[PDB]
Amino acid sequence: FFLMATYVTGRRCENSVPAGIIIGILKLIAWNINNPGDEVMSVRNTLNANAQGLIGGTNNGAVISGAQDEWFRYRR
Amino acid sequence: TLLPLQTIREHAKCDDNPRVTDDLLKLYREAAFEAAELYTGLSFTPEKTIVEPIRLKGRRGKIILSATPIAGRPVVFYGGGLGSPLELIPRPGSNVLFFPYGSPDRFQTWGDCHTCDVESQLMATYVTGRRCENSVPAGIIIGILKLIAWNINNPGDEVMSVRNTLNANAQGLIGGTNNGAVISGAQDEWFRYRR
Amino acid sequence: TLLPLQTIREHAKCDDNPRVTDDLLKLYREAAFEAAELYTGLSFTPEKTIVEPIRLKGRRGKIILSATPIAGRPVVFYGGGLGSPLELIPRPGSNVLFFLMATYVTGRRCENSVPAGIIIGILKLIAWNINNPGDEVMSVRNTLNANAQGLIGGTNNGAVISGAQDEWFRYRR
Amino acid sequence: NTPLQAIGVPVALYDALMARAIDSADGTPNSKWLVTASRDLDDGQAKEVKEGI
Amino acid sequence: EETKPGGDNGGEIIFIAGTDVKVQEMKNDLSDIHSKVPLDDQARTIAGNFGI
Amino acid sequence: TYMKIADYGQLGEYTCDAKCDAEFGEPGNIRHLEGKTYDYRGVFCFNRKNLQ
Numbered sequence: 001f002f003l004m005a006t007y008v009t010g011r012r013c014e015n016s017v018p019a020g021i022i023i024g025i026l027k028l029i030a031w032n033i034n035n036p037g038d039e040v041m042s043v044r045n046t047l048n049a050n051a052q053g054l055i056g057g058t059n060n061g062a063v064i065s066g067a068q069d070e071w072f073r074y075r076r
Numbered sequence: 077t078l079l080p081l082q083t084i085r086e087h088a089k090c091d092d093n094p095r096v097t098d099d100l101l102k103l104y105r106e107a108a109f110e111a112a113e114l115y116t117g118l119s120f121t122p123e124k125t126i127v128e129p130i131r132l133k134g135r136r137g138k139i140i141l142s143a144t145p146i147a148g149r150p151v152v153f154y155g156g157g158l159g160s161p162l163e164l165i166p167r168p169g170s171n172v173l174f175f176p177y178g179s180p181d182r183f184q185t186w187g188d189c190h191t192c193d194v195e196s197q198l199m200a201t202y203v204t205g206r207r208c209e210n211s212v213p214a215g216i217i218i219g220i221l222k223l224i225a226w227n228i229n230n231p232g233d234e235v236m237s238v239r240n241t242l243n244a245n246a247q248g249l250i251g252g253t254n255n256g257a258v259i260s261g262a263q264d265e266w267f268r269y270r271r
Numbered sequence: 272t273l274l275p276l277q278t279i280r281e282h283a284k285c286d287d288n289p290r291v292t293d294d295l296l297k298l299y300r301e302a303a304f305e306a307a308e309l310y311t312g313l314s315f316t317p318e319k320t321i322v323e324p325i326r327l328k329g330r331r332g333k334i335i336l337s338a339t340p341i342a343g344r345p346v347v348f349y350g351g352g353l354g355s356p357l358e359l360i361p362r363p364g365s366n367v368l369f370f371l372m373a374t375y376v377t378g379r380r381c382e383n384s385v386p387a388g389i390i391i392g393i394l395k396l397i398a399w400n401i402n403n404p405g406d407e408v409m410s411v412r413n414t415l416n417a418n419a420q421g422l423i424g425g426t427n428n429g430a431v432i433s434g435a436q437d438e439w440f441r442y443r444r
Numbered sequence: 445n446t447p448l449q450a451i452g453v454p455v456a457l458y459d460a461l462m463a464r465a466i467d468s469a470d471g472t473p474n475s476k477w478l479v480t481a482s483r484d485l486d487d488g489q490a491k492e493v494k495e496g497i
Numbered sequence: 498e499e500t501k502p503g504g505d506n507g508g509e510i511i512f513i514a515g516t517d518v519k520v521q522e523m524k525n526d527l528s529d530i531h532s533k534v535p536l537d538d539q540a541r542t543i544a545g546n547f548g549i
Numbered sequence: 550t551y552m553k554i555a556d557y558g559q560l561g562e563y564t565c566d567a568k569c570d571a572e573f574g575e576p577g578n579i580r581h582l583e584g585k586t587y588d589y590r591g592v593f594c595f596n597r598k599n600l601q
Contacts, residue, residue, distance in 0.1 A: 019107050023256070027232030034233050043235055048419040055419050057249040065232035069255035073111065076486035086295050088404055117488045140495070148322045159580065165324050165372070168337055174326070179550070182581035187558060189573045214302035218429075222405030229406055238408065239421025251421040258484050260405035264428035268309045270487045440515065460502055467508030 020074040024067035037061030078210065079105070079217065088225040096228050104227050108220040111257060116270050117144065118212070124204035129197050132156075137174030144171040145202035156198025159183030166202070169271065219257070219265030226260040273385055274300060274393065283398040291401055299400055303393045306430060311442045313385065314341065318378030325371045327351065332370020339366040341379035348373045388441055395434025403427060553580035 035041075040056025042048045048055070058064060081101055085091045096104075113119060126143050130153065133140065145151055150163030151173070159181035166173050185193045230236065237254040245251070253259065276296060280286035308315040321338045325348065340346055345358030351371025361368055408427045410416040416423060426432050479497060481490055499505045555578035562572050 018110050022103060023107050023227070027230075030232040034231075041235055042419055043237060043417055043422060044415065045417045048417065050419055053248075055248070055250055057247060059235045059237070059250050064235045064237060064250070064254060066230070066254060066256035067232060069258070070107075070111075072255070073115070073257075073484075073486060076489050083295055083298065086290055086292060087400075088406075089290075091290055114488055115486045140491070159582075165322075168321070168323065179581070179583065181583075182579070184579045184581065185576045186579060188576040193576060213305050214298055215305060217298065218302045218400065225404035226406045236408070237421055238424040239418075240424075244420065253424075253484075255484065257405075259408055259422075259424065261428035262405060263483055264425075264431060267483070268306060443514070463502035467502055467504075469508075471508030471510075473510065 018074065020071050023070040027065040027067035027070075028063060031063075031065050031067070035061070078109075078212075079220070081105075084221065084224055087221045088228055090228060101224075101228075104224050107227075108223045111223065112216045112220060112262075112266050116216070116266060119205050119207065120210070122205040122208035122210075125201065126204050127201045128199070129155075130200040132175050132198060135175075135177065137176065139173050139175050139200075141166065141171040141173065141200070141202060143202070143204040144169070144206075145204055146206040149203055151200055151202035153198065153200045155196045157182045157184065157195065158198065213269075215268060216266045219262040222260050222262045222265060223257040226256055226262070230256065272383060273304070274390060276300075279394065279397055282394045283401055285401055296397075296401075299397050302400070303396045303430075303435075306396070307385075307389050307393055307435070307439065310436065311389075311439045313389070314377070314379040316378050317380060318376055320374065320376045322374045323372075324350070325373050327371060329370065334368045334370055336361070336366040336368065336373075336375065338375065338377040339364075340375040340377050344376055346373055346375035389439060392430070392435030392438035395438065396430045399429050399433040403429070550581060550583035553582050554578070555580055 037060050039060075040047070040054050041059045042055070081098065082091075084101060084105065085094075090096065109120065124143070126145075128142060130139050130141065132138065141151065145166050147168035148165055151166055152161050152163050153175075154161040157179070162180060164173060185191075187193060235250070235254070236259070237250050237252075238259045239251050240253040257263065276293065279296060279300065285291050304313075304315055307313060318341075323337060325334050325336075336346065340361055342363035343360050345360055347356050347358050349356040349372050353371055359368060405427060407415075408422060408424070410423050410426065430436050477497075481493070485493070500507050500509065500511065558575040558577045560574040562574070564572060
């Protein structure tokens, strides 16, 4: 709260890479290599009958691992 | 020097069977220490002097220092009509300090068509890293051990999602709050320090 | 002298396994005494001075000390419209006093302490952390679960699912 | 025989209620917006959220 | 209890850390004990019967 | 507190009579500074009979 402004940005310099890549990208690439999107899963299980619509809203191929959550915690 | 790999491998049930090589355990440990420091507010280097324009909230002295300097080291102020600098002893643990309304001088520059005589903003310089000798309690330590113990066997293959507040979201998803160092004990560990 | 290692290894039944050495067990022992002096308060530190300025706006001058001095050592105030320094004997247990700079000491420990009630919560907190790390969030009776919706949560956190938090409330108010 | 004979109780009631007025005037919080966060908020932005509001 | 008019901490809030206590405030109307409606009716009867 | 205006700037420049503009000049300072005031006091006692 004081137009145009240019500014060199980025704490890159000494290859910052604090957390978010180191944890989230590894977790997500592991999820993408050993869990392709073909079948819905459940908590530590392959399928729960449940006799109704599946709960596979996100656990199919989305970001269920703590990857995006470490991304959260660093955005925070 | 803070935490050797032997303490990690002994608490985390991985001394006999490694389950992880060494360099990733370094890679996990760096992540373990740079997660709790910014969750509670801390660092890992002493005397982190920070120069920063301080924006006095209101006028009754609602200044907020973004790095919570030392518990008795005088923080210095300059600029923002402050013709002569002045020091200030801050609060330990909190950063809410008070600007004395009594001004020592006001060096204004009425009349100029090269800077529109607006102001040089109020600025402050102080030292962070009030943690020389590095005497962090075991509280953050045990939780960090719990963080690595969670991460050693969680490559991102299993879902491991735990429920949050009762009502199931209208979307019909599996839920939220599937987070390392959160769905484990870590949060409950280094919380006796967060105010 | 407060809690010897022989009591821990014989309580938690962990004495023939070299996975829990003395250095890691000491780290646990100091982590169960720093959380015991913080949920009910026990002042685990040697006598320690603190320099701290205080304020005025409080009408009658309600002054809270950010470190709750030991029980009765006179804290001296100076500066901030106060012409002459004066002492003040605070009430033990809390730091809410009544009427600027000040200095005091916060280090009450000379004679060994920790009556039996606190140790019991400490042994339970140690017995928890030695064989319950941050992985494998469990369920009832330490079992697992396949709850289709989510999981049960907040069970692998220490001192709350086991002992101390409620074995120490008896010394609160 | 003075009116003060039969006004003792009501003046006691009057002073008692006005005493309740004084105590309840100064002592009750006059603040609104009791905002409460969650347990995963990285204290260091929880102030940032506080500064925003 | 020590919040009555003229108490130690009188008029200040009550903080209970843990062991949530549960208060319920009684009504105790006590404002119709004489049955105002079926009282004035009978008063009108014993007054009207005297020719009043 | 009070004002302490330092030195008037140099405004005009005696420019040439062709340009459709002036030229900027140096500013002046005002130095809004303050000053406090002290107090003077003392006491002296007496008896009552020894003064009558």
